[PDB]
Design a binder for this molecule. Sequence first.
Ligand SMILES: [Zn+2]
Lengths: 147, 60
Amino acid sequence: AGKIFAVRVTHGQEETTAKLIYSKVRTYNLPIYAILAPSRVKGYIFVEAPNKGVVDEAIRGIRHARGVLPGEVPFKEIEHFLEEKPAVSGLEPGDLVEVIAGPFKGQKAKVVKIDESKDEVVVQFIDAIVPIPVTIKGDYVRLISKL
Amino acid sequence: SEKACRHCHYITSEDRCPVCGSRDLSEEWFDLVIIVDVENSEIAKKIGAKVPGKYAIRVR
Ligand SMILES: [Zn+2]
């Protein structure tokens, strides 16, 4: 387990910079354990290493890296970038859910179908006279009742 | 063109996943992780990466 350091990068250059650092790491056998460029973080990537000087070294000669924040990032503050599980996992036809964000917020619905490939759920609203299938993002629902 | 595997999340340019064998690859993916040292990495242990390389966290 290395420590987590934030590295400043040019906006739009997160993935490209991760990849150039990775190339240099491989060429010189630098003791960097991992690198993380969350699509929701713009202008910073994170580099897991034993200490800060190993990152300062690795980013030298890398055009779009602007420096390493001195204060390490606790591991808990990157964990929420690390969840591989679709938010729909566990939902089954017939389950009862609430929509919790977006236009249908507060409304309850019955699960018709999950698409874990796209992390979406197709639902029929409870109050609707005409039961039309609505597909919502997996993050916008919460399970109320299993069937 | 860089595709992520839906099954073990490795990134590959080719038409099957070189780590698990799956053909279920997506051009649609977010959050690039690169694991250099599987043994030393807390990132790798947390995501359960076993093989050094590129991974996507969210495969869509
Ligand atoms: Zn795979």
